[PDB]
Amino acid sequence: GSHMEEAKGPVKHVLLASFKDGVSPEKIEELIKGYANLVNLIEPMKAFHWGKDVSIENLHQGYTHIFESTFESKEAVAEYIAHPAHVEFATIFLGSLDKVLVIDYKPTSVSL
Amino acid sequence: GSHMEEAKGPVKHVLLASFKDGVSPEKIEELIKGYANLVNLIEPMKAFHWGKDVSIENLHQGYTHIFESTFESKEAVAEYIAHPAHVEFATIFLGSLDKVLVIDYKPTSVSL
């Protein structure tokens, strides 16, 4: 029980990836399904949900979808990205990636 | 199955726009300034969240930032799109708009 600091942000991470034309569809199944098992292991994650262009599912330059990971420490997010288990997958995805943009989003609304 | 209960929502819309080259800073703040005012004007608007691309050094396509507006649903989005206030600003932004992609992101957790 390391416990560690409690809460921090929370910080929101916005990531978008587009599967190029060549990767099998079934692979995407295990990729998403595998992600569920990945989080089941990756202690540092808390929760991980996905989000695809919901609306017309077309109007887009080629986003495909985005993946957000809930964290309680910007530092922990570092350990996550510095994970071999995750890297193993990201490495496989790289073998067939069309585009990927990693960006961090923080909840900072303006007072009205 | 499924009953009339609040869950899954609301829906989080993600938008990424880039400012063409030759855009002044005073304009950036102006646009962001107006938005805050527009948010106050736009009656239909759960909440307005804004964020900055964390780590622009590298790993980016040129998003710079992303606009995310909270809506009750897809129906509410129609109201936003059917807004003259937003249109007025859109026309102004068009004066210096590079790219604009609309994407919807919803937190969909999977049972582990």
CB contact under 8 A, A14 and B66: yes
Token pair 């330059």: residue: A61
Method: NMR
Range of the domain at B59: 1-112
Count of structural domains, chain B: 1
Nearest-CB residue to A36 (from B60, B101, B110):
B110
- Separation between Cα atoms, residue A93 and residue A89, nearest integer Å: 6
- Alpha carbon of A78: minimum distance to chain B alpha carbons (Å): 13
- Please check whether residue A16 is in contact with residue A105, taking contact to mean a CB–CB distance below 8 angstroms: no
- Separation between Cα atoms, residue B42 and residue B83, nearest integer Å: 8
Nearest-CB residue to B105 (from A51, A103, A110):
A51
Q: b/e per residue, B2-25, with b = 16+ CB within 10 A?
A: eeeeeeeeebbbbebbbbeeebee
Token pair 């396509």: residue: B61
- Separation between Cα atoms, residue B32 and residue B26, nearest integer Å: 10
DSSP H helical ranges for B42-106: 74-81, 84-94
CA B64 to chain CA centroid, Å, is 13
Beta bridge partners of B69: B48
Domain with B103 in it: what CATH number? 3.30.70.100
Q: Of A31, A38, A25, A9, whose CA–CA distance to A92 is shortest?
A: A31
Tokens of A41: 């292991």
